[PDB]
Amino acid sequence: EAPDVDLADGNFYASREARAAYRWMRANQPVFRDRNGLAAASTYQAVIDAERQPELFSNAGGIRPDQPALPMMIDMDDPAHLLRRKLVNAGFTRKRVKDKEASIAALCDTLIDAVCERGECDFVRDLAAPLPMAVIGDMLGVRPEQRDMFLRWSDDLVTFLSSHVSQEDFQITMDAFAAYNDFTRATIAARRADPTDDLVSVLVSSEVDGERLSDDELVMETLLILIGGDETTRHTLSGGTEQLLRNRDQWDLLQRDPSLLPGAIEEMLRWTAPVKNMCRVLTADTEFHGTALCAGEKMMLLFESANFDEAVFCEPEKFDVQRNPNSHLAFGFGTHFCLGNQLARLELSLMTERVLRRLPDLRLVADDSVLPLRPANFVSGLESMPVVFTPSPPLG
Template identity: 30%
Template sequence: MTSFDLASDTYFDDPYPTYRQMRAERPVYYCATTNLWFLSRHADVVHALANHDLFSSSAGNALSDSPLRVGKTLGSTDPPRHDELRRIIMRGVTPARIELVLPWIRDELAARLTALRTRRHCDFVTEISRPLLFGALGRMLGLGPQSARRASELSERLFRGEAGPAGPALDEDDRAQVIALLSDELARRRVEREDDLFSVLIAAQEAGAPLGDAEIVANMMTVLLAGNASIGHFLPNLMHALWRHPDQRARVMADHSLIDGAIEEAVRWDTSTQCFARTTSAPTDLAGMAIPAGARLALLYASASRDETAIADADRFEITRGKVRHFGFGFGPHVCLGASTTRAMLRAILPRLLTAFGDYEIDLADAIRVRHLMVRGFRSLPIGW
C-alpha cells in the first residue's frame, strides 16, 4: 500500500507531485505518525467544508491546536457561534479600514526600495515582505510600537517545525508571551480607544455581544499570527511563482491590469495555507475508506486547488485563467476573513515591486523553506535585480 513521506526535503521543496499521487492512489490517506487523515481531492475537500456538522472545527482548525483558542475563535467554532463571531470581527475589517493602511504600505515600500537601490539584492522575506506586511497588520490591529516589535519577533518563530511538521504553530512559552502581550494591549485599549480592531471588539463587548476578554485576546492572536503566517508567506510565494514563469511575469510587468489575475492564480497555484484541520463528529465513509468518529482530518487545500478533475490543466500557472473554485482563501463558512485585505495590500505592493526589480533573479539554492504541513513559504529568499 502506498505511503508518503511528509517530512522529507523532497516534499517540502515541492509537495505537489506527492499530492498528485495521493489524489490518484490514496485520496483519503491515514498517516500513523501524525494520527491524521489527509483529504486531497477537490470534491472531498468541498464536501468536508460544506458539512460542518460532520466535519467540525470545534476541536480547532490547526493540526495541533491550543486549548487557549479552541472554542473561542473563528477557526475553532462552528455555526452558529462562528457566524456570530464573524459578524462582530467583520466590523473591524472593512474596506475603509484597509484603505487607511495602504498609504503607509506605499511609503514604507518606497523607503525600503530606495535603501536597497545601490545594493540591488536582499533577503526578500526579512528585508521587505515580513516587515512590510507585519507593520501593516500591526497598524490594522492597533498595536503600539513596542508591542508591534515584540509581536513581530515572536511571529518569526511561527511554524518552526521543532515539534515535527504537524506540531503546534508556536511553542507554549512563545504562545504565553503573545497572550500576555495582547492582554496588556486589551487593558490599555479600554482606556485609550483608537480606530482599530481591538477597539471594535471592546465596543461590541460593551454593547452586549457575547464576547469575553479571553475570546477577544484569542481572536486577536489568531488574526495576528494567521495573518503573519499566510500573507507574510504568500508574497514571497507570488514572487517565486512569477520568477518561475518569466513569460507570465513579463505580461504583468507590461500590463498592470493583470495584477488581480496574477494574485488570484498565485494563491491557487502555490498557496501559503496548505491545509486546515477538522474533526469528525460521527463515523463516515470517503473514497471507500471508513473514517471513525473523533478522527482528525487535514484538508489539503493546496492539493484540491491543483486537482485536474476540477480545474483544467491545474498544474499550469496562468494569470488569465479566470474564475475557478480554489481554496487559497478557503471556502464555505470559514472562507478567509482577510482575503480582501490580502488582495488590497498586494495590489498596492506588486506593481511597485515589479517596476523596481524588473527581470529579477532568485537564488533558490540558498533559500530556506518553511518545514510545516500547514504552511508553505520561505524563511529566507535571496533576490537580486
Template identity: 35%
Template sequence: MSAGPKIPPDLAATIVDPLAYGAWQPLLDAYATLRREAPIALAEIPGYRPFWVVTRHADILKISKDNTTFLNNPATVVLAPIMAEMFVAHLMNGSPHLVKSLVQMDAPEHPKYRRLTQDWFMPANLKTIEANIRTIAKASVDKMLAMGGECDFARDVASMYPLHVVMELLGVPESDEPLMLKLTQELFGGQDPDLNRTRAVQMSAEEATKIMAQTVADFNAYFEAMAQDRRANPRQDLATIIATGMIDGAPIPDYESAGYYTIVATAGHDTTSASTAGAMWALAQDPEQFAKVKADRTLLPGLIEEAIRWTTPVQHFMRTVAADTEIGGVSMKAGDWLMLCYISGNYDESVFPEPERFDATRSPNRHISFGSGAHQCLGLHLARLEMKILFEELLDRLDSVELAGEPKRSQSTFVGGPKTLPLRFKAA
C-alpha cells in the same frame, strides 16, 4: 475510528514530515499519488491518532462548506502527535487548544465573534486605508532599492510589509513589530530549526509543544496589557474593538480575547507574506512572465490569485466528524478526525491543468487557499489589496529580477512558504 482504505506507510510519513514541506516536490508527488490512488484514505502513523487524509479539491470544498457535519472545536485543528495533544489538554484543563480563536470555534459561537471585526476587513472599510497601505508599500520598495541590487525578498520585503499594515490596523506600535514577527515565526515555524524559539533541529512532540506554549504565553501577556490599555483609553483600532467587544451581553473572556488578538496579529500578516514571496519567486525564475505582467497590469489580479494558489500558505486544517456521513464514497463515523490537505486541493489536476506551473493568466482559478464556508479567511480582501498595491509599486520601479541563490521554504506542516528568497534586481 471508521474502517476504510489506508495510506501506504511511506506516503503517510511524507505528509506529516516538516522536511517534506520544506523540500516541496516530494510532498507534491505524494499528494499526486494519493489523489490518483486513494483520494480519501486513513493514515495510521506511529505516535498519531488515526485520521482521514482528504486530497481532492472537490471533497475538500464539500467538507469546508458543511460546518454542521465537520467541526473545528472538538479537537485540535492542527495536526499534532498524541503526546502533544495530551500535553495541551493537561496544560489547558482539558481544552485541546492552546489558543482559542475564530479558527477553533463552531456555530453559534463562531459567527458572534466573527461579526465583531468583520466590517474592518470588508472592501468598503479597506478603501479608507488604501492610501496608507500604498505609503507603506512605497517605503518597502524604497528600502529594497536602497539595498543596491540584491536582497532577501522574503526577509527584507515580504515579511515586513504586511506586518506593518496589519499592526497599524490592530494598533500595535511600530517599535513592537519585530517582537510580533519573532513570535509569529516561532508559532508557525515551530518545526523549523531556522524559525523555532530554541533553533533546535530535533525535538520531541512534548518539547515542541512546551516551547510553543511559551510563545503563546508571550502573546497573551502582550495583548492582555494592550486590552487593559484600550479599555481605559479607547482608540479607533481593532485592539479597541476586541477589548471592548461584547458577546451575549458580556465582555469577551480572557481566553477568547487573547486568541482573537493572536489570530489577527499572526494570520493577518504571515500568510500574505508567504504569498507575496511566492509571487516574486515565480517572476524571478520566469523573465518572460515578469515582462508580461509589467507591460499589462490587467494580469495583476491573476498573478495574485496564482501566487496564493501556488504557494498555499495555510497547508492543512483538521476537522472532526459530528455525525456519521459519507464523503467521496468513504463512510465516516462521528468522532473521526480528518485532514484537509489544501496543498493537494490546489494542485489537483482535474481543476488546475499543469498545476505545478505558475501561470498568471490561469482562469478560472478556483483555489481553496482562503478556505470556504463559514470559516473562509476573514482577511482575504485585505490580503489581495496589499499584494496588488505592492506589486503595482514593484513593477513600476523594477526593470528585472532574477534569483541570486536557492530559495528555501519553511519546514512546517501547518503554515508555510518561502523563508529565504535571494534576489538580484535592476531598478527601472
C-alpha cells in the same frame, strides 16, 4: 504503490515531491490515509464536500492534527462561531480594509526604499516577511522598532502549530503567549478608556445580538489575526513573486498591463497555498468518498493538493496569471473562509505593483532546487530568496 509519507511531518511539506504524492492520492485514494493512518482529503471535490458539512466535519476539536482546541473563532462551530465572527468582522468590513490602501502602500515604499540602492536583497527577509507584520503591527498599536519582537512571537506560535514540539519549545511558546497577552491586555485597558481608530478600539466597540467581546476573547481573536495574517501572507508574496521571476513572460505581461494584477494575485495564492492543511474532527462514523472515517478522528483538508487538482485546474503545474476561472482554496471555503482574505489580497497587490515598477529588472540570483522551504506541517513557504536588480534612488 502509495507514497510512504507522514502528513503530520513538516519535512513532507518542505519536499518539492509533495505534489507528486498529492497526485497519487487524487488518482488512487482521494481520502488518503498516510503511513500512520492519518486521513486527508486530497481532491478539490472531497475538500469542498467536507467544507460544506460542518456538522459532520467539525472545527471544535481544533484545526491541528494532535493539539486540542483553543477558544477562538477558527476552533468553533456555528452558531457560536457565527456570533464570534460577526463581532470580529467589525475590523474587516470592506470599507475599513480598502481604506488601509494608502498606509499599506506607504509601508511597501518604505521597505523598498531600504534596499533599492543596494542592487541586491533577500526578498523574504527584506520585503515579504516585514510587510505583513508591519500592517498587523500598525493595526495593533505596535511601535515600529518593536515589530521584530512580535515577528518572533508569531514565528514561535506558528512553529508550535506546525509540529509536535519538545518541552523546551513548548515553554518558548507559552512564554511568547504570556508576553503577547500582557501587551494586548494593556492595549485593551488603554482603549476602553481612550478609544482610538485602531483594531482593539473597533473590536471593543463591536456589538452583535446584544453581545460584546470579553477581554479573554479580544486577546484570543487578535492572536488569531496576528498569527494567521503574518507568515501566511509572507509566503504568497515570496513564492508568488518567485514564479513571476522563473517565468519571465509572466513578469513581462504584468509589467506592461497593470489591469492583469488581480488575476496574478489569485494565481500566486493558488500556487503557494501557504496553509497546507486545516483539520476537521469527525462527529460520527461515515463513508466519505470511498474511505471509512471514525467518529473522533481528525481529517486534514489538503488545500495545496486541491489547488493542483487537474479535475478543476487545467494544466495545474503551469503558472498562468491570466487563469480564468481560478477558484482556488488557498483561503479555504465555507463558514471558516479566511476572514482576512481582502486584507491579504490588498497587501499582495500593493507590494507587487511596486516591486514591478521600482525593481523592473528584478531577477533571482540562483534557481529553486537550492531554495529551501521551511519544514512545517501547517504554514510553509520560502526561507530565503536572494534577488538582484538595477539600483535606484529611494522615494523618501
